[PDB]
Ligand binder design. Sequence first.
Ligand SMILES: CCNS(=O)(=O)c1ccc(F)cc1
Length: 145
Amino acid sequence: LPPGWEKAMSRSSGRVYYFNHITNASQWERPSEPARVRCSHLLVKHSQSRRPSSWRQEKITRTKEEALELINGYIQKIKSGEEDFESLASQFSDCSSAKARGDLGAFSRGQMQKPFEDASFALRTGEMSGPVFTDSGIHIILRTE
Ligand SMILES: CCNS(=O)(=O)c1ccc(F)cc1
């Protein structure tokens, strides 16, 4: 397997799947570095975020567990096609980039917080992360370039 990826076993179904411990992505199919990458993200802040405030809420009070539940729900809606990433980012991201559909632009290594950077550079073009934790909160990352 590529680095970052491991085989895993579904607990409910017994079917093999693949999990990436850098991006927290999981998928059924077997998976198959850039100077810069371009990503969008959807951030859900919690009461332990470095700045527990956002354009959505002056005082963010949800627990980290509650933030993760929200992230997990958004991931479900994106993967089912019931909702688009860009739509959910514009509506519900606690980052100011919500107004740009979550787009952060292009960036190099050494600019972003490290778990976010590592996830971004491990994603393939077009691929989306699982929940990624930083001091800002919990992110869904979409690599666009
Ligand atoms: C700075 C220009 N406004 S923005 O909303 O596109 C934005 C906000 C935060 C970012 F980290 C990146 C882009």
